[PDB]
Design a protein around this ligand. Structure first.
Ligand SMILES: *[C@@H]1O[C@H](CO)[C@@H](O)[C@H](O)[C@H]1NC(C)=O
Ligand SMILES: *[C@@H]1O[C@H](CO)[C@@H](O)[C@H](O)[C@H]1NC(C)=O
Ligand SMILES: *[C@@H]1O[C@H](CO)[C@@H](O)[C@H](O)[C@H]1NC(C)=O
Lengths: 196, 105, 121, 115, 36, 209, 38, 31, 118, 209, 196, 121, 105, 36, 31, 29, 115, 118, 38, 29
């Protein structure tokens, strides 16, 4: 079926540049306009700019005229956004949205991508620190000190609270007897039981 | 976050709960008690930048204090009348000596 | 991170905060807001300079801090502990400075004498 | 009190002498020799004669909103132009004048002999 | 004790020393000139 | 530009209910409006475009209406899959602008949270820190505040309010409230408490020794 | 201590000023003599 | 303080002047 | 009225209050009774010996017997340090020194000139 | 920047009711929040600042709370003067940003509109135009749609939906729906109708001849 | 009492420049920062910039750094905003808000002004055209073809619907027997009765 | 308001829309979207030019319109009614053009003859 | 809004609801019926910009039609071989005449 | 009827006419040169 | 069409050439 | 008709011009 | 029909001749002299010999997806190299040759006489 | 099979179909029967007079009696305009004109050269 | 009408081209004669 | 003490210098 597939999450140091790819499949790539939409500040969707894949010309939102540069590789059917001198404000989820070629159907986006999450920060993949919470019965499991977002904290291999940030590390406060913390960021797997 | 600066026994002391790290200026001497640093005598004009490091109430809040002392034992009170008179009579005597030299040759 | 620079010219003490070049900066002395329209006309801040006239060591010495417009005074890290003794027409010079003064006086005197002697012949 | 509002704070860190009038009033006028020497400057209740070693001498009054303070007379002898007339100083100064007149007398003797 | 005034007095003393030396040198140079 | 706004950021309705979502525009956008559906996992689909036209593959349970500056998206017969965030976009003048989006959350029975206090872990005191946690759990609706107490005195520093979105099998909210304190700060006091108001203040506490 | 330094210092100031006066009056009389010769 | 060394530097320069003078004399006479 | 008359010579300092030409004499320094019984009290003046900048420096009060310091008209705040064989050189005294030295120097120069002329 | 949002653009509560208004921040704004009151006539006053401190002269019926990114303004004992638009502003980092604002509207006493149709004025036909008007009036609540009909056929062109805010003595909404048509377009048809749905479709019509 | 008073409504042709005045009264003018807030797009409040009256220095919102220039006349205690090359987007109500001088109390605005409404348009003060609406009883009164906003349409000297805009003229559809239309824009006063 | 410019070079007809210089423009022929990736390779639009090759008067003549990116085709006012007959190697010239051609041929011939005559002597 | 353009009797007609205002190019002749304008014969290559003005359906929506006719009675079919031969023989004859002139002088 | 080909035939006729005039001029000039 | 005037212009130029020639002759002989 | 007139006139003018130029060369001799 | 899918649309506004094959098929191959002259170009079902006056002469076939169309033979006489041998034309041509040979004979007579 | 043989002279045009060397002859132009009863039908050929570009120009059908046009193998689409005393000049005919004129011109030039040489 | 113009026009083309051939052969023979003389 | 030593040493060096310069001028004669 018609499908747009995006690169994947990226951790980029501030002041650098990152190039994002949206590989189009299942349709004639050059017969449709591709738009870029940024979802930052919680849920705020903003339209960044569109690229005409057949001609290569691009139109931009005046807000993002200096932050993005749209390029298209017609051979591999992939679209590109490059984010220039990205600051902490550029941490968001960037979407690629297909729309029509001509002015009659190019203002609505029929096919969307999954979206790539950029985390503009200066931090390193610290291994996680784990704490048991003891007073069926409520039993807790704190996970601390891991910078990259992905983490899976199950119970015995429940409300897996979303990660938060007060210092430059994430923290997942799983709840529920062994707690299992898988850390695909720094490749750490730690198990611990709850004994008061 | 203001790093305390103490003056006792006429020697100035920069005092903070975490170890003091010198940045620029007066190196000082590490007292037998860590996290305390005496900048020498108060009258020697201690001048330096010092970073103390976050306490329990303020975790990971580094502070930087630039102590600047100007208490001059080498200060002299200029009297412009006296300085001008001295310099003018200097110039006059020098001109007189030059005139004597010109008369000699 | 740029150090505070303090310059003393007799009674006047001038403090400059070059850490924030762009925005307008504001001053605070011992957690009391200093500068701007107030009763004391001795103190006035323009650009990054705080000009304290008739400086009083017992009164106007302590902690000084600069912060730009749009920042709270509480979230400040770089502090200046200015404790300075000040008098009128007071200047600091050491033994080597006055030695240079007298030596250069001798040098200019001798140069004038030699120039006069050479011009005579 | 007895209307003696004038006090002094001395032994400051910086060499000076400051006279304090015990009045929180507007236009506290200090008088000298029976006439006002100047009305109070704004927001400052203290008159500062200056540094300690100037040796102020005179008779000073004070008047705030109320009647005049009973005047306080201050005598100061931070003497600056002081020398000791001990044996060493006088002997050295007289040695110096003796040698000076001796050399100038030798010079004028030579000048008059050759001229 | 305050060192501010006595230091300036010392500076004036040195100025007077150098004045006196220069004047003595002037007097002897012109005395030699008068002899010659 | 043409800034697009929505009347409410969230609304609640039970299964089988008919729900409308509003969208307003700064100017008249001449029926150039599109409605999008963002599922919580991140995927987003176009529902209707040009204010009425269903997009091929989108069920006809969704409908659109409106003219001028006032628009509407009417969902009929809310199922479980229909819980997502819904956005409206203009197509009148460049740049295209979206609205804030409205999150749908199903309704349930008004329960009360199960406040659970926890002392800092033994490894944490040896590590030098102390994070006292609260586990408010399953407390429909979403109106809830966590007030922290230390030996009868309030403390609003070091708080981390981490919330979970609606569960797909109870439609319940879960809360975590953590206070980040040092080992020295932990031993200085003995009574630690956090309070919950489900809409009276629920109380649970632990003592250091 | 330092006060004695001040006393001797100002005494030296006065007496060296006095020596300077002696020098300048000597300069005056000798200048008159040289001008008479020249 | 400036210390009495501030007296001393001028006396030092005039020592060096005088010793140059007497050395010039000792070189002029005999030697 | 007339201010107090004070004279200092060397280390000793003498004070007198012309406010009352004839009356009982009582002296107070820093609002404590000083004088009477070395330091003593004169029938009209105050005899102060071994004056010190720290020991005796403050307000001075002259008043008749059976009275309080506030009845005394003017306080006398005196401060000084004293050195042996010390005096204040006035501008006039300096001027007399100048004139004496210039006169003696010129006179002896002329005398030696006339002496060596023959 | 730090974008500030509010949960709902409007809320309704009757006199004497206690009402809360929420405000959320993109980042943690460290309790640097202020609440403003904008009266409908245009004047705006600062209610509370630094999340709790009442501003001198503001009645203590208003209260503030909140920490981190979630804030609240609680009005107690709503009077008639209390109906205004309320904004929340950040003070953490420059630029200062406001939110959308929440409009308070007191609650009815559900009524029904009085749909009134009008033919174009005689001077308008001589002028060459025809503006057929609808006068939906006093129809609490604010949910209402004007559907226009010409001789049994719908017409969505030339519509002007002009609404009035709450009256201060009945708290009632009034509607005007005008269709701008030419004199020639007017005579081509005879049956003109506009429909109203107070929440079934209310019908009223006039005929040209 | 402490009060900020603003100039008044202004009609400015597109591409021109308009200077706005906020005369401060009842307090020490130089002891407080004055902020400027723009309310456009219905109700959207935006902070434009602040001026330090004592020094004359100004700080701007990066959005409005080119659109506004803040000047202060300390003698008459008046503040000024000048809007440069104003387009149709600059039609709003501009507020002047007083705040503290120092960083401790300059982020909240204690005293606000009334606000000046700018209408950036290209149109002229057309006289109004009036129509009677006939089928107690509902009777209408249409007012058309007047460009400047102010107008007072009473009955016999009622829901005075707010003015709207489909073409470059305003229109007030008063409702309720004579209708009285006062037009302080073009100085027109027209009365008409309702007879079917 | 700037007029449409149409240039014909044999079979090829090129239309240019200079009304919108900044944005990318799009074309429409008789309310059918024309240009971009389509079956017909005769038609291609770059910048503001629409290049129609193998132009057919019966087929490709009618209404043409340009609009920029971000505008609807319906809100267009300036239309071009291009009805042109086209053949291969067809060119338009009038009597005066060929008269100029023959006159300038005579002129260059006479100039060459006079130059040769003058260079001979 | 496309302004109709009609071709009848071999003379092209720009027809609209409202009176046609000429802007540039072919002035034409105002027909006895207003709002109708004949641009002359179709074969005379009418070229012009014309503004017609909105109807009852489209109030105040002015349209601009730029009619461009290229049906050339003056078109000639060039044959590059023949043109090149003619020009080459022209040059050859001109060179021959120049050679004769050079021989004469 | 189509005017495209006949017009080019006319153009070729005129080109041939300038050809013929130039050739006749060449022949007459060379005949005069041969006489002289 | 180009019309037979396209024949005519070349004939016209050669008339003018011939009439210049005959005028030159009539001026050369007698006159 | 008209082009035929052009060719007949061309023939007669060519004859006349050749004769005139030859006779002018004869007389100039 | 009888498999005569080949038709012609003529009398167009622009001088040309176009042959239409009555087939909406892919790779409709036209044959000439028993062999294919070219397979169908994309999306175009019509073969265009060109302008009318080229006078195409030959035998043409057509084959779409189905079997070959029964071939249509076209003869064309848009004659271009045509003149009328009427009395006026022949008389003018012979007059022209007579005058041309007369002038060249006079020229060669002069050349041979003088040489 | 063998294509139709067609010959045109001046205004008249003659057509013949060699598909059937001997058979009944029936002619149809534009799918209507033409020929037989000036325009007539020959035992083998078609005699066409006063041919016109508009009156007679289209497909031509040759078939024996008792048959339909689709049985006839190939249609013959003919178009032409005819002028009196008109013919097609081939490249060969043009070439013979060139050779004839160049030969006669050179021969007469040489003859006059020899004639006027003596 | 125009067809007759085409007929006479192409006839003029052929027969004036023939005149041009006569002219060029005349040029050839006279060139040979002149080269023999020169 | 020390400054007094300075003034005595200045006196003696001035005497030594004046005598030395005068006697050098005598010997150079
Ligand atoms: C340093 O330690 C002392 C004593 O424990 C404590 O009172 C003080 O608050 C600490 N300093 C800071 C800056 O927190
Ligand atoms: C001070 O805290 C900082 C936080 O960045 C850390 O880098 C540093 O190592 C700490 N220093 C000490 C002495 O603990
Ligand atoms: C055409 O409509 C326009 C709209 O501005 C107006 O200027 C003009 O007067 C109208 N012309 C006619 C003839 O109605």
């Amino acid at each position: 079926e018609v499908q747009l597939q995006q690169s994947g999450p990226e951790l980029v140091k501030p002041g650098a540049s990152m190039k994002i790819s949206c590989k189009a499949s299942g349709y004639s790539f050059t017969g449709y306009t591709m738009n870029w939409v940024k979802q930052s500040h919680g849920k705020n969707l903003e339209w960044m700019g569109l690229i005409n894949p057949y001609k290569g010309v691009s139109t931009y939102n005046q807000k993002f005229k200096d932050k993005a540069t749209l390029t298209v590789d017609k051979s591999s059917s992939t679209a590109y956004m490059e984010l220039l001198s990205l600051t902490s404000e550029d941490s968001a989820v960037y979407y690629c949205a297909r729309s029509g070629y001509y002015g009659d159907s190019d203002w609505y986006f029929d096919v969307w991508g999954q979206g790539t999450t950029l985390t503009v920060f200066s931090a390193k993949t610290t291994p996680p620190s784990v704490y048991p919470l003891a007073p069926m019965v409520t039993l807790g499991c704190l996970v601390k000190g891991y910078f990259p977002e992905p983490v899976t904290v199950t119970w015995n291999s429940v409300h897996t609270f979303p990660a938060v940030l007060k210092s430059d590390l994430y923290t997942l406060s799983s709840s529920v007897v062994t707690c299992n913390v898988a850390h695909p960021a720094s490749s750490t797997t730690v198990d611990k039981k709850i004994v008061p | 976050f203001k790093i305390p600066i103490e003056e006792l026994e006429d020697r100035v002391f920069v005092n903070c709960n975490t170890s003091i790290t010198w940045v620029e200026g007066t190196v000082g001497t590490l007292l037998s008690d860590i996290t305390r640093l005496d900048l020498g005598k108060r009258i020697l004009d201690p001048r330096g930048i010092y970073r103390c490091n976050g306490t329990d109430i303020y975790k990971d809040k580094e502070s930087t204090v630039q102590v600047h002392y100007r208490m001059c034992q080498s200060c002299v009170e200029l009297d412009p009348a006296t300085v001008a008179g001295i310099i003018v009579t200097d110039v006059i005597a020098t001109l007189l000596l030059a005139l004597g030299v010109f008369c000699f040759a | 991170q740029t150090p505070y620079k303090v310059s003393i010219s007799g009674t006047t003490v001038i403090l400059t905060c070059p850490q924030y070049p762009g925005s307008e900066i504001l001053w605070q002395h011992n957690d009391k807001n200093i500068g701007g329209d107030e009763d004391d006309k001795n103190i006035g801040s323009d650009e990054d300079h705080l000009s304290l006239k008739e400086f009083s060591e017992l009164e106007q010495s302590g902690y000084y801090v600069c912060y730009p417009r749009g920042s709270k005074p509480e979230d400040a890290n770089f502090y200046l502990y200015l404790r300075a003794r000040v008098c009128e027409n007071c200047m600091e010079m050491d033994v080597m400075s006055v030695a240079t003064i007298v030596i250069v006086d001798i040098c200019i005197t001798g140069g004038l004498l030699l120039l006069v002697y050479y011009w005579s012949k | 009190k007895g209307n003696h509002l004038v006090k002094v704070y001395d032994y400051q860190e910086d060499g000076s002498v400051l006279l304090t009038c015990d009045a929180e009033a507007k236009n506290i006028t200090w008088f000298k020799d029976g006439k006002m020497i100047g009305f109070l400057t704004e927001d400052k209740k203290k008159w500062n004669l200056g540094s300690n070693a100037k040796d102020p001498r005179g008779m000073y009054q004070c008047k705030g909103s109320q009647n005049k303070s009973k005047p306080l007379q201050v005598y100061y002898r931070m003497c600056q132009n002081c020398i000791e007339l001990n044996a060493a100083t006088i002997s050295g100064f007289l040695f110096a004048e003796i040698v000076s007149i001796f050399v100038l007398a030798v010079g004028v003797y030579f000048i008059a002999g050759q001229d | 004790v305050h060192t501010e005034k006595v230091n300036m007095m010392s500076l004036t003393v040195l100025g007077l020393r150098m004045l006196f030396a220069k004047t003595v040198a002037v007097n002897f140079l012109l005395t030699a000139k008068l002899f010659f | 530009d043409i800034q697009m706004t929505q009347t409410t950021s969230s609304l609640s309705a039970s299964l089988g209910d008919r729900v409308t979502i509003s969208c307003r525009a700064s100017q008249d956008i001449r029926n150039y409006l599109n409605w999008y559906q963002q599922k919580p996992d991140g995927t987003v689909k176009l529902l209707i475009y040009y204010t009425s036209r269903l997009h091929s593959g989108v069920p006809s349970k969704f409908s659109g209406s409106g003219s001028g500056t006032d628009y509407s998206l009417t969902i009929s017969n809310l199922e479980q899959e229909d819980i997502a965030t819904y956005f409206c976009q203009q197509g009148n003048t460049l740049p295209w602008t979206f609205a804030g989006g409205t999150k749908l959350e199903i309704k349930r029975a008004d329960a009360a949270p199960t406040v659970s206090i926890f002392p800092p872990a033994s490894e944490q005191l040896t590590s030098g820190g102390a994070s006292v946690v609260c586990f408010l759990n399953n407390f429909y609706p979403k109106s809830i505040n966590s007030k922290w107490k230390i030996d009868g005195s309030e403390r609003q520093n070091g708080v981390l309010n981490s919330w979970t979105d609606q569960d797909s099998k109870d439609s319940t909210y879960s809360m975590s409230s953590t206070l980040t304190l040092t080992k020295n700060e932990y031993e200085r006091h003995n009574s630690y408490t956090c309070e919950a108001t489900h809409k009276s203040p629920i109380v649970k506490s632990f003592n250091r020794s | 201590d330092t006060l004695l330094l001040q006393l001797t210092n100002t005494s030296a100031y006065y007496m060296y000023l006095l020596l300077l006066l002696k020098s300048v009056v000597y300069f005056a009389i000798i200048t008159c003599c040289l001008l008479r010769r020249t | 303080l400036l210390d009495p060394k501030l007296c001393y530097l001028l006396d030092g320069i005039l020592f060096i002047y005088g010793v140059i003078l007497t050395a010039l004399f000792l070189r002029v006479k005999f030697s």
